[PDB]
Write a protein that holds these residues in place. Structure first.
Motif, PDB file in Angstrom:
ATOM      1  N   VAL A  40       0.816  -1.281  -0.035  1.00 52.76           N
ATOM      2  CA  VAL A  40       0.022   0.006  -0.039  1.00 52.76           C
ATOM      3  C   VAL A  40       0.664   1.349   0.029  1.00 52.76           C
ATOM      4  O   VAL A  40       1.729   1.501   0.738  1.00 52.76           O
ATOM      5  CB  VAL A  40      -0.873  -0.088   1.248  1.00 52.76           C
ATOM      6  N   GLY A  41       0.523   2.245  -0.941  1.00 47.98           N
ATOM      7  CA  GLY A  41       1.492   3.292  -0.865  1.00 47.98           C
ATOM      8  C   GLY A  41       1.285   3.941  -2.252  1.00 47.98           C
ATOM      9  O   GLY A  41       0.176   4.271  -2.681  1.00 47.98           O
ATOM     10  N   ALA A  42       2.577   4.429  -2.936  1.00 48.18           N
ATOM     11  CA  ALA A  42       2.539   4.938  -4.292  1.00 48.18           C
ATOM     12  C   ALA A  42       3.400   4.114  -5.301  1.00 48.18           C
ATOM     13  O   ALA A  42       4.457   3.201  -4.796  1.00 48.18           O
ATOM     14  CB  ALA A  42       3.097   6.492  -4.059  1.00 48.18           C
TER      15      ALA A  42
END
Lengths: 16, 16
Positions: free
Chosen positions: A1-3
Motif C-alpha cells: 500500500v502506498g505509491a
C-alpha cells in the motif's frame, strides 16, 4: 500500500 | 471511461 503502480487513483485506465 | 487521470489501473496511490 502506498505509491507506485497498481490500482487506486492517478494516471492510467479507468474512470474520469 | 477510458484513459487519463482519475481512478483505475496504472500509476498513482493505492494498492500494489
Amino acid at each position: 500500500v502506498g505509491a507506485x503502480a497498481x490500482v487506486x487513483w492517478x494516471w492510467x485506465w479507468x474512470w474520469x
